[PDB]
Coordinates of C-alpha atoms in Angstrom, one line a residue:
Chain V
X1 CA -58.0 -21.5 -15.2
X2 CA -59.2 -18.9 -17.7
X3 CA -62.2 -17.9 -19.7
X4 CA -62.4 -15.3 -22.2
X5 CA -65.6 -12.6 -23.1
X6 CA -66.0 -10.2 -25.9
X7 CA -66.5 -7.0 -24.7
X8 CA -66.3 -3.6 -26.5
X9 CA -63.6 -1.0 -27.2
X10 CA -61.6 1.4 -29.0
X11 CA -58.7 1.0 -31.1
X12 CA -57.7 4.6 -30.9
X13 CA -57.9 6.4 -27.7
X14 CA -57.4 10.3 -28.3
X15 CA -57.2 13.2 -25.8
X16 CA -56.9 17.2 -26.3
X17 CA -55.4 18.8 -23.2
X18 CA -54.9 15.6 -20.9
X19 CA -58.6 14.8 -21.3
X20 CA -60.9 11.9 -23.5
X21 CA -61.8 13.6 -26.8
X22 CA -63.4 12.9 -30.2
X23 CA -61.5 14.7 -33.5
X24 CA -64.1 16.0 -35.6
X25 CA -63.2 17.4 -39.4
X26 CA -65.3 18.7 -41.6
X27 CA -65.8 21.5 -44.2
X28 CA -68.7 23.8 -45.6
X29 CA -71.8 23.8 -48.0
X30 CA -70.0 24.6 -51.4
X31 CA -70.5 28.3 -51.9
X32 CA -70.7 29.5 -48.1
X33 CA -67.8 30.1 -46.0
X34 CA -65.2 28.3 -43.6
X35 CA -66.5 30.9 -41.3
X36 CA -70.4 30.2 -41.6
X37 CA -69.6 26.4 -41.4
X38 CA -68.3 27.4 -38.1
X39 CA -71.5 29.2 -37.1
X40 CA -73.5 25.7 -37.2
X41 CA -70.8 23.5 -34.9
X42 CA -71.6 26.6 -32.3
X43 CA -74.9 25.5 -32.2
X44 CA -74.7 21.9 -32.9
X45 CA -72.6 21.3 -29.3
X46 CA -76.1 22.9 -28.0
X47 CA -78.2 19.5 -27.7
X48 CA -74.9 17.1 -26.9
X49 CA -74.6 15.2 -23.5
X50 CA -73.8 17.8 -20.6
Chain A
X1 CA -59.0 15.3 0.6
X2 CA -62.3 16.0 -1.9
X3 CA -61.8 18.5 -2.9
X4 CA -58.1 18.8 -3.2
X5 CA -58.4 15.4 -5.5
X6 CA -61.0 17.4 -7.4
X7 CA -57.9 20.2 -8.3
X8 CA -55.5 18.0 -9.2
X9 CA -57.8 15.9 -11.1
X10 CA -59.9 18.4 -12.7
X11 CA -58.4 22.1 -12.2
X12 CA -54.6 21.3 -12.4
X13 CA -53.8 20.0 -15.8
X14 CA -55.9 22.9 -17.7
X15 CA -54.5 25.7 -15.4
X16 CA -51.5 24.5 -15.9
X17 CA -51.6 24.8 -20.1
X18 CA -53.2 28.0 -19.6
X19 CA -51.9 30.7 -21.7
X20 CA -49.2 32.3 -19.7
X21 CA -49.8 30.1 -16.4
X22 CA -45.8 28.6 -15.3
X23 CA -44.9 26.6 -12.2
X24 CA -47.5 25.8 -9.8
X25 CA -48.2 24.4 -6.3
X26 CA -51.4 22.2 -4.9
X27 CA -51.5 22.7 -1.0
X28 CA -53.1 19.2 -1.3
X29 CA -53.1 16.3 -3.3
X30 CA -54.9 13.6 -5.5
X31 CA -56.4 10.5 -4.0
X32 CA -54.1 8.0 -3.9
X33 CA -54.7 3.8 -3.2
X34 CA -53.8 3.9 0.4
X35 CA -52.8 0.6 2.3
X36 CA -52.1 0.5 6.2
X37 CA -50.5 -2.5 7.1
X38 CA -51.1 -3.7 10.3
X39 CA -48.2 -5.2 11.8
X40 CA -49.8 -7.4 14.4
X41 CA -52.9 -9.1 11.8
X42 CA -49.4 -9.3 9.6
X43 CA -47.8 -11.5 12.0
X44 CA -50.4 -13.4 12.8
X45 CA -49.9 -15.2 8.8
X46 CA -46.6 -15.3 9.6
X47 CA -46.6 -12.7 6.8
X48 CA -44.0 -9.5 5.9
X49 CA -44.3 -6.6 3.9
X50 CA -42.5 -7.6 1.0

């Protein structure tokens, strides 16, 4: 009575303020700044899926 | 119904962790699965509620 499929999916669903999200950790170009690194993920978000 | 739904889904959950924000109160609601049993098409399977 029963069939089974692979489908796709996550081992580790995470959400930021009762909503899907992706954690994202990084650091900057040795020699810059925590606060220049920052400067990029500003503009990075830009170009991402509205 | 719409747009109610789109509060508590959408507006609701980040209002409510907003800096400073306490209690609250929708005048409205989400969407729920609604079922309306009719008691007569019940009957007729000689079925019950339970």
């Amino acid at each position: 009575f029963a069939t089974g499929k692979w489908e796709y999916g996550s081992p580790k669903l995470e959400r930021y303020n009762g909503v899907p999200a992706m954690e994202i950790l990084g650091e900057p170009a040795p020699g810059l700044s925590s606060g220049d690194a920052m400067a990029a993920v500003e503009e990075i978000v830009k170009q991402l899926p509205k | 119904e719409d747009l109610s739904n789109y509060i508590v889904s959408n507006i609701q959950d980040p209002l409510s962790r907003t800096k400073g924000v306490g209690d609250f109160q929708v005048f409205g609601s989400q969407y729920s699965m609604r079922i309306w049993l009719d008691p007569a098409k019940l009957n007729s399977y000689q079925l019950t509620p339970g």
